[PDB]
Design a protein around this ligand. Structure first.
Ligand SMILES: Cc1ncc(C[n+]2c([C@@H](O)/C=C/c3cccnc3)sc(CCOP(=O)(O)OP(=O)(O)O)c2C)c(N)n1
Ligand SMILES: Cc1ncc(C[n+]2c([C@@H](O)/C=C/c3cccnc3)sc(CCOP(=O)(O)OP(=O)(O)O)c2C)c(N)n1
Ligand SMILES: Cc1ncc(C[n+]2c([C@@H](O)/C=C/c3cccnc3)sc(CCOP(=O)(O)OP(=O)(O)O)c2C)c(N)n1
Ligand SMILES: [Mg+2]
Ligand SMILES: [Mg+2]
Ligand SMILES: [Mg+2]
Lengths: 525, 525, 525
């Protein structure tokens, strides 16, 4: 067998059937004779390739495989890798290297010091020392991406390796099963259960690893049992709980003092599947107030180590949420009461308030819609205004790196063909990965893109206000016609300048058989 | 003085007056109170920011200053840094970091292990240990980028540092002059001159550091004196010699055997300002044939170390080319005869052959035009067909990373307002950095973009043919309307489906007062 | 030819004839069939191997070649590499790797992520992608170590590579000559000469790269011409000037304020071959006082970039010192007057004052002795008390890393068989690399080791006093019998408890035919 044939066998035997890629010359020997049972999803720039693969991996809850061109292709993807690191996305990134006989002279397209290029944004990064090692290296990459805490990995392969003979002993790689599905030992889990059972006023805080594990339903049972309010940890990349369940409290503000104040009076705070905490703004104060103690369940030792407070347990979120939900007592306390519905903001016949856009989406979208957010100034309103009943219903760039949602929404729609994906993306953010639109057109992946056009980088105007910063350049982005960009890449395009046109455009998009972009004129901040 | 005021003083005193940027929240404290004598050039994605700055630095022959947002912004620019490394471009890349009080908890937008992110594509990468160190660190970055061999550098600055008090001793940084303008000592330079004077059949090979040094005219005098043919080193990122001078031979093929065969019978080959050599294709054979010896003058120790043959001298290209051109004897041999003009390829009334496009550009463009190439399958024809008399007339992505020429052509046009820039870019390559078009529209930088539309990644079809590789996916890019993309970003757009329309479109673009994009329908390979 | 035969041919053709090593199993395929024209110098621990090679390279002014065992052997040498980085020592460090078929599984003795292990203490670090690349990689290592600014390099080689067939084109590597012997261009050098000629009160400051370049005599001519006082830059690893020449001023204190005060009233300060400056203690103040400007000539861009003041020129120290010494005018000012001799410290019939030891060494050692210092509390007195007329007469660990002088003194003595080496080493410092003594015994390298025994880490007691730090543990080192350690490793040993015994012991050591260790009882601080 060749290294090529052994490698595609390993991939298929490990459940991989799709290559997300932008091809180049060092990759043609890998991509030739492409197997008939695989599919190749082309995107036109590598931030788009990786973002599509990342949405697909997060929604499918399985690793996604990427092929990029040498150093420049890998480099164009590194902002996308920053988000994938923070979302624990299981991405297997491969890149082609020059032929081994050409690496010493540093021929054009040599990836110099290749394994160092994507650091520190990968769990494992490697270039094999010989051709016959490639299948074993690929096996290491698959399992490094897939074991808890999941995350991106990188493998560089000289182009001459693929046609060499494989080691016949590589067959032992094909069916390896590697598990990190673990939970706290019995004795210590009993101590934790008794602490939860004994709390007088527990609170629960959930992060994105809950949605990744599909632990959402177990966390609903846990919160119902403990009769406890549930918040989503700050800077949330996913939604871990039904947002109209009576226990739901919403998204935590990303500030130290704000969070300790919110938790004041709760004696035990159980955090599951989140860093403690992904703060953002400067908001100094106490980490926790007197009388509150915190216990964190995390799948990531790096999260456990850096929490400034609380106890921690490093374990699989699926296994721990299931065990806690089935072991805790049913408290006799009253179930929390549901938050009230948000109010309708006054809306005239002109430009749209963001609040109106989300209320209208909530009114018209199917109950199993999946939303993506890259409308940076409107996140609080989006979290209040969209009823997300089901798992896998929300994604937001986990490292704050713009250029995620447009491509990721195409990958999510590919992963979930029966759930309507609706990406709500600011006019600024839409540009970072605009060419991803072409992949939705070419493959007919029916994502709906809602572009919130207010002419400016609104969140930066907000942060500049907080800092009291004057005379900052570069904050305005006038003069972009999103209908024309959609036409450029083959996507049907609509414009909504008022509420009547928003409703009409959404009814048309929801009825369409392909991807649709709607440019919405929103109010300037 | 604050760190902010001291830093902008250092920049202005070191000749920096322009910030190329895409802003973010960790950078607002740097960008506030932006000085009235500086300009800020916004681009919508960071590969575009860096590419614009890189074209500006290469054409201006001085460092360019960039400001990006944390890890994700820096990561989105890393393919652009791969080209800047290979072109020795003096780029000062700064990125904002979280406030120092928030870095430990890894708050959102913390750039983790920041100085390692852009490695190995930078000469120096650093985050200061305190606020007061920032001006000194910035001074180190300026000089590291600017000293031979020039190249990109990286500095990460916590956002809280800018408002702190500066060290009053920082004033000693402002007027430092650092020189690497050096040449080989007298005794050894005399030995080299005598070897050149004594050669029976010398050849000269020039690389991009000649154009960077503006050593082109000195190299013409040197070649006239020695009566020697002149080639451009393979994979050429710049043009170092007038392409219709009688000594000019053209671009070397990027193969080991091809180059030794070309040099056969030349007793001494003097390479100036190039790696030895930036080969690309697999073309095994002899590095040099019997009877040829090679001497390399390079500004980069890494180039001298990795050459597989020849002697080398590590020195400034400007100083060495000037000294050699003024010291060598006038040989009594006959001056080489000029290459003949290329032939006209037969052209019907349909889609354009690339050869027709370059002949027409050559006929109609001003004699001081500047060209950019990212039409990967047509490079040989472009080098034969365009008469480039002047320095600074050609750029091509030095690491082969697509997404360079569209933004770089805007930076070059900003650097050279009186020279018409014409970027010739394939339909595939045009997508990587398509949003750069918006910066040309917003600032009215009158670059002309010629998009060669043949529907496919043509160079990859070529390389697949060489490899005899069948069933490769992802090679076609149908369905892109470049006129609509230009409209999307505010650039006037024309289409040329035949030669009559090409001539008309070029006459209109050449007469226009702003940037123009022409979509040219070219023949499919 | 095999890779083994081609590599030893490359080494011999590049002037390498000695391997400093501690062998291991991954290195046996390199070391077998060891060529009869090479010598192998064994040391018992890798800090000793590297220190011996470093003294040999610094004294011979040529690269030295080292072979170490995998990761653990390389790791044991990393404190020695820290000194070699700071002294710009041209060291070629090679380490054996597992066979390529065993690297993936991480067999015992695999050097994981090998090229990253010695960073940041090396100029270049690499593992080749195939066996046939090894000779080319070795060529890169030789030239990277040898080009200005010289320094250590690292190459890792899988053990199976040595018996593979070499590429016949590797012969082009054997005779490559690479030069960095460069100086500032004529026009700018004339500007610098005119500034020196015009100065009213110039001062000269010299660093270790002057001694490395053997530029000492040219710097004496330069100082005589300019009639200028000469200081040695602080934290001096070498001696660049005759210490009883009338212009000599001594070692600069390593403090910011102390140095600006020393230079006050000097209008132009020319620094050659030093960082600006290797300060140590906290001594805040002005970098330079009003009226003094500084010009630095350095072979190291990293030094030029980080100087907090002055202009800089990056060039070869030998070439620049020769050009300046031959171009400057003979000033009509009076030649500086020689510093007076140091005073005799009162000495009773008991334990020795360090001052007495250095005066006695100066009285009895030959005029061409070479000294090494690792007696950390006595450096100021050593620099006042030893007349060092000749180049290559002093070495002190350039990064402050103890364990350098004992092994380095053996390498220096091997490099300079006709110059008596005398290492003056504190009782604390002597332990770090004590096993190096065995190499002096086995090869009969007649270094004299003078151990200053005061029972304590004296310099740390001093620094603790400056900090006013009380209750610091670990400062005393009682209970070491250095005569017994010397016996353990086969070196003749003497003890001196008073001045009479010091004189007798030195007369015996100076007359001996092999290495001698003298334990001197010195006064406690
Ligand atoms: C790759 C990249 N580059 C730049 C930034 C900086 N940045 C951003 C940030 O630095 C801050 C992000 C942040 C921080 C906390 C919470 N949410 C977001 S936001 C932004 C403007 C986006 O504008 P738009 O999409 O039109 O939406 P709004 O008008 O609703 O705000 C920018 C530019 C970024 N986050 N990522
Ligand atoms: C960031 C990035 N991603 C991918 C590649 C791979 N690649 C390329 C390469 O891997 C090879 C590049 C090369 C190698 C030697 C010389 N010149 C170029 S070329 C290419 C197609 C570009 O298509 P287009 O612009 O339409 O022009 P042609 O039709 O005339 O060819 C691609 C996609 C690349 N070079 N850079
Ligand atoms: C590898 C290593 N480990 C530890 C140190 C720390 N250190 C040292 C340092 O941290 C400081 C070094 C310094 C700083 C400036 C100038 N000169 C030296 S000195 C020292 C004691 C050495 O004792 P000894 O040899 O008996 O001489 P003295 O009695 O005359 O002082 C020690 C231990 C060190 N420098 N290097
Ligand atoms: Mg906006
Ligand atoms: Mg094309
Ligand atoms: Mg001591």
């Amino acid at each position: 067998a060749s290294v090529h044939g052994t490698t595609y066998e390993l991939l298929r035997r490990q459940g991989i059937d799709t290559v997300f890629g932008n091809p180049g010359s060092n990759e043609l020997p890998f991509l030739k004779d492409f197997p008939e049972d695989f599919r190749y999803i082309l995107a036109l720039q590598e931030a788009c390739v990786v973002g599509i693969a990342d949405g697909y991996a997060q929604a499918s809850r399985k690793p996604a495989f990427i092929n990029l061109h040498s150093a420049a292709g890998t480099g164009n993807a590194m902002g996308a890798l920053s988000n994938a690191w923070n979302s624990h996305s299981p991405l297997i990134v491969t890149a082609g290297q020059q032929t081994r006989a050409m690496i010493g002279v540093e021929a054009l397209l040599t990836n110099v010091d290749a394994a160092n290029l994507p650091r520190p944004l990968v769990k494992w990064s490697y270039e094999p020392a010989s051709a016959a090692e490639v299948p074993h290296a690929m096996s290491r990459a698959i399992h490094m991406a897939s074991m808890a805490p999941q995350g991106p990995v990188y493998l560089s392969v000289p182009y001459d390796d693929w046609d060499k003979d494989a080691d016949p002993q590589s067959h032992h790689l094909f069916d390896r099963h590697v598990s990190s599905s673990v939970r706290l030992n019995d004795q210590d889990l009993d101590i934790l259960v008794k602490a939860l059972n004994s709390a007088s006023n527990p609170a629960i805080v959930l992060g994105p690893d809950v949605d990744a594990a599909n632990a959402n339903a177990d966390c609903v049972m846990l919160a119902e049992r403990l009769k406890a309010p549930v918040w989503v940890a700050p800077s949330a990349p996913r939604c871990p709980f039904p947002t109209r369940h009576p226990c739901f409290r919403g998204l935590m503000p990303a500030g130290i003092a704000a969070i300790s104040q919110l938790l004041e009076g709760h004696d035990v705070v159980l955090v599951i599947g989140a860093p403690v905490f992904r703060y953002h703004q400067y908001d100094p104060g106490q980490y926790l107030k007197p009388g509150t103690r915190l216990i964190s369940v995390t799948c990531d030792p790096l999260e456990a180590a850096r929490a400034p407070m609380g106890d921690a347990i490093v374990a699989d979120i699926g296994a721990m949420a299931s065990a806690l939900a089935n072991l805790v007592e049913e408290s006799s306390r009253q179930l929390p009461t549901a938050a009230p519905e948000p109010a309708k903001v006054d809306q005239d016949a002109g430009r749209l308030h963001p609040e109106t856009v989300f209320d209208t989406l909530n009114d018209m979208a199917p109950e199993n819609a999946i939303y993506l957010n890259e409308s940076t100034s409107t996140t609080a309103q989006m979290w209040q205004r969209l009823n997300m009943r089901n798992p896998g219903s929300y994604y937001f760039c986990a490292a704050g790196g713009l250029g995620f949602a447009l491509p990721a929404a195409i990958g999510v729609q590919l992963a979930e063909p029966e759930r309507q994906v609706i990406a709500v993306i600011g006019d600024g953010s839409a540009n970072y990965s605009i060419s991803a639109l072409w992949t939705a057109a070419q493959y007919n992946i029916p994502t709906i893109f809602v572009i919130m056009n207010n002419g400016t980088y609104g969140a930066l105007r907000w942060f500049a206000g907080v800092l009291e910063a004057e005379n900052v350049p570069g904050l305005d982005v006038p003069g972009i016609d999103f209908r024309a960009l959609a036409k450029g890449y083959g996507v049907q395009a609509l414009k909504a300048d008022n509420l009547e046109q928003l409703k009409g455009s959404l009814q048309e998009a929801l009825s369409a058989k392909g991807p649709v972009l709607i440019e919405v004129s929103t109010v300037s901040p």
